[PDB]
């Protein structure tokens, strides 16, 4: 086994060893909740009577949306964060990148905080798209707009239309009925041949095909979950394909740290000697954002 012990100390030791060079992060909603961004897959929200929808989940379906986009953008206004301040967990991944350890971050989130925290396009697989860019729905024009531009149109309740061709401009998220990004399957084929460590943060691993990513790790590859709850285990209510095994007598590589993601990454950082660097990074980045509204 590559972990000397199935603890955070054990993972930290392995990370500082020569054996650990290429880290994949798998992240979800629980890495952005402390930034005041809710889980759009949990019981947030329900009262969409307003929008006269054929069925509830038509608000996030692509055919509906291209026909009647006003509902989605009005809800976008209600849900739009007052500020985009990435968390300790996002800045932790920036530390990984700075230290040469980050192979890739696969994210379920659309809130752009990974990019704001300084992960680049190349470092990221936005499994469900992002608000960071938007494009004109016309394939011939496909004009790109930044989030600031999308923000304004949303917060001014004026539908986003292309300046060049007056088409609708859709945020680059994956609505229901859209194809999952081809980059997801491309990168998965290539990345999991190189991975030395899977950091899994802020996801209960319920949405497919993202959940299946943990089965793509080599058998030897250590896997750490930072989360408010254990997750990723085999589910007998489905079949009975290599789920997380933390607590059995056959456990050899999987570790669960339970709590706020923020507190988990701080603890991992403290063990690695990075807590000061991480603190200094968050504070100057936060101040910088606070200063820019």
């Amino acid at each position: 086994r590559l972990l000397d012990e199935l603890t955070l100390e054990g993972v930290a030791r392995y990370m500082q060893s020569e054996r650990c060079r290429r880290v994949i992060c798998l992240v979800g909603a629980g890495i952005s909740t402390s930034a005041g961004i809710p889980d759009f897959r949990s019981p947030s929200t329900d009262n969409l009577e307003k929008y006269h929808l054929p069925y509830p989940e038509a608000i996030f379906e692509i055919s509906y949306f291209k026909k009647h986009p006003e509902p989605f953008f009005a809800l976008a206004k209600e849900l739009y964060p007052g500020q985009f301040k990435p968390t300790i967990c996002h800045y932790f991944m920036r530390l990984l990148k700075d230290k040469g350890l980050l192979l890739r971050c696969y994210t379920q989130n659309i809130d752009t905080l990974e990019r704001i925290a300084g992960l680049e396009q190349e470092d990221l697989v936005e499994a469900h798209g992002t608000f960071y860019t938007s494009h004109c729905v016309s394939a011939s024009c496909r004009h790109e707009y930044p989030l600031s531009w999308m923000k304004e149109k949303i917060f001014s309740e004026v539908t986003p239309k292309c300046e060049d061709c007056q088409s609708l401009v859709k945020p680059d998220i994956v609505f229901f009925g859209e194809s999952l990004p081809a980059r997801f399957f491309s990168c998965m084929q290539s990345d999991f041949l190189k991975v030395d460590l899977l950091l899994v943060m802020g996801t209960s691993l319920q949405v497919q095909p993202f959940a299946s990513l943990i089965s793509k790790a080599p058998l030897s590859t250590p896997r750490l979950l930072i989360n408010k709850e254990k997750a990723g285990q085999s589910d007998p209510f489905l079949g009975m394909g290599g789920g997380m095994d933390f607590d059995s007598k056959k456990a050899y590589r999987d570790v669960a740290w339970l709590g706020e993601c923020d507190q988990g990454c701080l603890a991992l950082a403290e063990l690695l000697g990075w807590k000061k660097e991480l603190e200094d990074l968050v504070r100057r980045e936060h101040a910088s954002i606070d200063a820019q509204s």
């Binding site: 989940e57 009925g177 194809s179 999952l180 095909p209």
Partner: peptide
């Protein structure tokens, strides 16, 4: 593949 809820 396509993004489905159900």
């Amino acid at each position: 593949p396509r993004k489905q809820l159900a």
